[PDB]
Amino acid sequence: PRETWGKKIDFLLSVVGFAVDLANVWRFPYLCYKNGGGAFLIPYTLFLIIAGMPLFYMELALGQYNREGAATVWKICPFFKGVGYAVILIALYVGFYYNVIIAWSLYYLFSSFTLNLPWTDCGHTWNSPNCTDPKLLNYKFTPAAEFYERGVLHLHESSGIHDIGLPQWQLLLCLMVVVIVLYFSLWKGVKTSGKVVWITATLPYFVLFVLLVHGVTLPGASNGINAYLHIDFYRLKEATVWIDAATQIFFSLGAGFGVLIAFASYNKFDNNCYRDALLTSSINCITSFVSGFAIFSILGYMAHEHKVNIEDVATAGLVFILYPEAISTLSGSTFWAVVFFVMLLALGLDSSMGGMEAVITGLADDFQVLKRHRKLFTFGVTFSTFLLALFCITKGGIYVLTLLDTFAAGTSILFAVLMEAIGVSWFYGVDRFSNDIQQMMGFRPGLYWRLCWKFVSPAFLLFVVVVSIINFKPLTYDDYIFPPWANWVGWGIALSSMVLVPIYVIYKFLSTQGSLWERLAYGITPENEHHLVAQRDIRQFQLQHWLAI
Ligand SMILES: CNCC[C@@H](Oc1ccccc1C)c1ccccc1
């Protein structure tokens, strides 16, 4: 039997916590400003209701209806079972560096427990004479940038991706602690991992409100707020704004990676999935908008304090460089540093728990031995993640982290989600999915949702896929250029998950017995309906099914 959530509130908190993560607080705030201002909101909202909510709701419906993980849920059409393996591997890839992004915040929180913060000004061992303090004197030479790039990452010792050095004894301890906490928050199941979400998905909102209350009443935050909401429709007539909105919507709503299906597998049949999807999606967008409102309030204050136009202060390490230098100037710097970094720790842990849960359930459902000895399989997966993340904490840790960030979660998963949409709308049948959703609650999906899932979501996602490959810029870090074998390895990593779909397609084709027609029918019909193959009642071969909306 499935563990099953103990409360709809716990399930909603888990899903909303997985949705809102560091991206929602670090990307959208300045993505709304990279454009002309305001012209990004319209595409953001439009793409939300057109593809981000429909695809999110479709993913949630599959898990609840079929009660399976990320790979086993493709029993409805085994040809695409490779999609589950691809998404599982991509989740395992992303975790490697997401844990390090959490470890940095842990280190910052530990370093924040002093009356005098270590990033106030120069004079420490890790600060070069070339430093320049704005208060001590009338652009990586600022005290905060120097702290981040020498006292945390120790980049000065590194020289490139080919020269990574050895792991740092401090980040080693930090990553060990965070990984141990993650393992102890998942070693039992949803009975335990659902309890810790009550705090990890609620602390960020309390911290955000506390920070907004102060930020609104600041000497120069009004300028930042008006700049954040500067209405301007001239930029809407471009293509970069639409591409940015599409990619941001896809990569926050969370649809795909294989964590929404995992969570929805633990729900009951009489749960209102159509309402839960709308709740989660609306909360995500509202949190992003308020997060931008809060984020630019402090950038405006810093701009006013420095007496420089906001374009100058406008800017992975943005939250590790901008704010640490901003909080120091405020009253109660020690009071606010701890809170701000605890918020980042909550965001990161809350996302990582969901990712690891998705991988764990996806593999356990496939393998009953692991489903039984989960207490050992979780340790195995966590230790593999720790060993592979050991590389992303060396002296040149940021280089490898950037490579993984731009190659793992990219076209590799963008194609997987397109495969899931295709295999759900065309092969399985949008009418069949609507019938299943009706069997779940009682009211069929609206014609608008039906028209979305079949034509709009696949076209949208294919558009993003084709855009994110032709416009692939060469891999660079600020000013350092990567060697050719670095890009070769990045492409290999990205393609390792892409190749998993066709390889399994051919594997199933060869394994299945019979003639070509029999093999094709068996590979598309669900296991329970396989008996119809002998009777020759395959709906995929009828034009009516293909032309059914
Ligand atoms: C909600 N934002 C997405 C969360 C997060 O999902 C994770 C994180 C770690 C391991 C596994 C997964 C699926 C993610 C982060 C950055 C790029 C893509 C996904």
Ligand SMILES: [Cl-]
């Ligand atoms: Cl977003």
